[PDB]
A paper describes a structure:
We turned to prepare SeMet-labeled PcSTING and solved the structure at 2.25-Å resolution. Although no nucleotide was included in the crystallization solution, the strong electron-density unambiguously identified the bound CDN as c-di-GMP. In addition to the specific H-bonding interaction, each guanine base of c-di-GMP is sandwiched by extensive π–π stacking interaction formed by F171 of one PcSTING protomer and Y235 of the other protomer. The planar guanidinium group of R233 also stacks with the aromatic ring of Y235, forming a unique Phe/Guanine/Tyr/Arg four-layer stack buttressed by the four H-bond interactions between R233 and c-di-GMP. By contrast, in PcSTING/MySTING the stacking interaction of R233/R230 and Y235/Y232 locks the conformation of the guanidinium group of R233/R230 into specific hydrogen bonds with the O6 and N7 atoms of c-di-GMP. Moreover, mutating the specificity-determining residue D252 or R233 in PcTIR-STING relieved the growth inhibition, validating the importance of these two residues in recognition of c-di-GMP. Each V-shaped dimer of PcSTING associates with its neighbors on both sides, which are symmetry-related by unit-cell translation along the c axis. The small helix α5 interacts with helix α2 of the other dimer by both hydrophobic and ionic interactions including two salt-bridges (K212–D301, K220–E306), one hydrogen bond (S213–S302), and the close side-chain packing of F303, K212, M215, and L216. The loop connecting helix α3 and α4 (denoted 3–4 loop, residues 267–276) in PcSTING intercalated into a groove formed by helix α1 and α4 of protomer A’ and the 3–4 loop of protomer B’ of the other dimer. The interactions are mediated mainly by the protein backbone with additional side-chain contacts of I273 and M266.
Numbering used by the authors:
A (entry chain A), B (entry chain B): 157 to 314
Write the structure that this text describes.
């Protein structure tokens, strides 16, 4: 019963699965700012470290990658899925850094950050373990979904 | 620690806090479908039971309450916060059923929901414990935030 497992499941059910389904079944028939894409990819970007504010790391990564704000109209949620994306030739490259990981940080930040300001090596190990388990569960869920296996990737670099 | 704790923290950081901040500091100067409200409330609706699809229960509850889709404009996220709401006199009543709980359900289904089809009383016990811990952690986070303490409530009835 790891919390990163539940976080990965919630992230997959509430975003990754719907985004992959939109890429596979709706994007080829949807015009995004004038263009019609035949191929799309969703890239999951992990934070370099689980810092105090994952939203700021996400904003910085999106601006440094030259992404623009777009949205996908889905039928499995009452409101569209907001994303950041860019064009690479004929491919629509969507990126996302999972903001749901925020809680994870605070959880670790409430168990190890004691009697000191920085991050002990034990906090770093527990953080890396939670990160790796999140990535493993997310990859297992992606592999069991045809659309996700088709168009979703977890980014490698740190 | 407990996955319900991390789920509550992520739900508070990614929605409840921002919605309360919008209600307190941005709603009195924003037109919601033509009207400008001076008082607003956010009501958190827990599912009666943690069923297979929390999005369907949420849609059903929203239709049974006569709610309509609106959106809040926030400066802490690159895209607006989508909500369901209604008008009660001069008060804007916002409702939300936390879809993030979905993962929790599935997690429980991988430790007890075996060798049977339904939900045993022991699995139901663990599910109720996770739900109660989620509600308690969320309430503790609400009480430590002035805006949330001002305008956020967890619904009573089952
Ligand atoms: N780029 C992008 N990512 C998405 C989107 N929808 C979900 N995600 C990601 O998937 C995670 C789980 O979403 P959730 O299950 O609906 O669980 C959500 C959801 O219950 C609530 N929440 C967040 N934003 C909203 C909102 O705008 N409206 C409502 N009614 N609830 C929200 O807080 C919980 C946590 O949200 P997050 O921490 O950000 O964590 C979210 C987020 O990282 C999207 O449209 N665009």
């Amino acid at each position: 019963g790891l919390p990163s497992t539940v976080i990965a499941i919630s992230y997959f059910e509430g975003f990754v699965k719907l985004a992959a389904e939109w890429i596979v079944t709706e994007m080829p028939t949807t015009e995004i700012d004038g263009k019609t894409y035949t191929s799309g990819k969703l890239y999951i970007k992990m934070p370099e470290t689980l810092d105090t504010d994952i939203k700021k790391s996400a904003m910085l990564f999106y601006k440094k990658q030259g992404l623009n704000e777009t949205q996908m109209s889905t039928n499995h949620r009452n409101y569209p899925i907001h994303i950041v994306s860019k064009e690479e030739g004929d491919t629509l490259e969507v990126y996302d850094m999972p903001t749901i990981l925020s809680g994870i940080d605070k959880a670790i930040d409430m168990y190890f950050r004691v009697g000191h300001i920085g991050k002990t090596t034990e906090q770093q190990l527990a953080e890396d373990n939670e990160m790796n388990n999140f990535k493993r569960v997310l990859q297992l869920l992606i592999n069991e979904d045809s659309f996700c296996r088709e168009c979703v990737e977890i980014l490698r670099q740190a």
